Design a protein around this nucleic acid. Sequence first.
DNA 1: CGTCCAGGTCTAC
DNA 2: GGTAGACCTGGACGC
Length: 314
Amino acid sequence: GSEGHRTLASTPALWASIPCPRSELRLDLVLPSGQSFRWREQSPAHWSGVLADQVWTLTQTEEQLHCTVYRSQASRPTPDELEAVRKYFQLDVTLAQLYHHWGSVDSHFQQVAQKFQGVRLLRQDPIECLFSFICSSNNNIARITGMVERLCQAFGPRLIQLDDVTYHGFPSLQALAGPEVEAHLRKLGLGYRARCVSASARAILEEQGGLAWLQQLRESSYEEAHKALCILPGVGTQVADCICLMALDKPQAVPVDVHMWHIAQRDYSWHPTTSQAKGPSPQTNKELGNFFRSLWGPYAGWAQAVLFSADLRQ
DNA sequence: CGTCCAGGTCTAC
DNA sequence: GGTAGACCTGGACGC
Ligand SMILES: CCOCCOCCS
Ligand SMILES: [Mg+2]
Ligand SMILES: [Mg+2]
């Protein structure tokens, strides 16, 4: 009871609650669906991971999101700590209101939304998001998830151990820019993305003026932010859109991968009309992103997250 | 066991 | 501009 990952049943006094209906949040549809790669369902309905530099376990009942933290004596999370959870889930954004809107303007969205409630966007750290999505390219979620864990294990600071799992914070730019990072990441199975991690960490610190440059894209425009990210090695349109949506507070950013292509054709009979290219291409991928913005409006990326997630499950 | 595929990015024509 | 091929890996899918 004192050791291992906590459950709600087994250590009741160490949990605290955040009011939040399952209609506003389904952990099981958000945490393994390729937004963040850093959460594991270590016991049934309990998700463990690192969030604002500490380890947490999260579980839900119909009206509550229950939260425990591992930091000192074992105790309930504090009000300030609980805030970090609220911010990470962006719980001020009311998902019932967005679903209504998207539902009204798109009857296909209405149909999928009935069976896939509580899919919202996490608000992620820019560095973690940048380097996770560099690992995402031409890859599947199961393998990306391992790549990311091994990366944090080798280069990130040791937080705490539960059972046989040692949690690590996400690596700094400095660690990722270090000597022989590529060769090390190649032995950890990252393949060609090993080079991209080293190169982007160095590009940021040595050519772009460091962490500040990345962080300040939050206050910049989607279009400025998206252009700025594309200069980095391993960061194309898609990876940049993932970062803008998931880390830089750009809700209108819509990543366009093979899933979204399939969704467009199957469920909207979409075809490009500004370019003569039949398939995925820079100009057809731009157009498809514009189609979804025009359809769903300024939170189109959030709508994308609902159908993307629902397409993973089918 | 050989292709094909997964939250693509690159350069080269 | 739209197009093709190279780059890691390891599960799923046939033949
Ligand atoms: C998909 C292969 O290209 C990845 C980005 O270019 C190489 C720099 S690390
Ligand atoms: Mg606690
Ligand atoms: Mg780039």
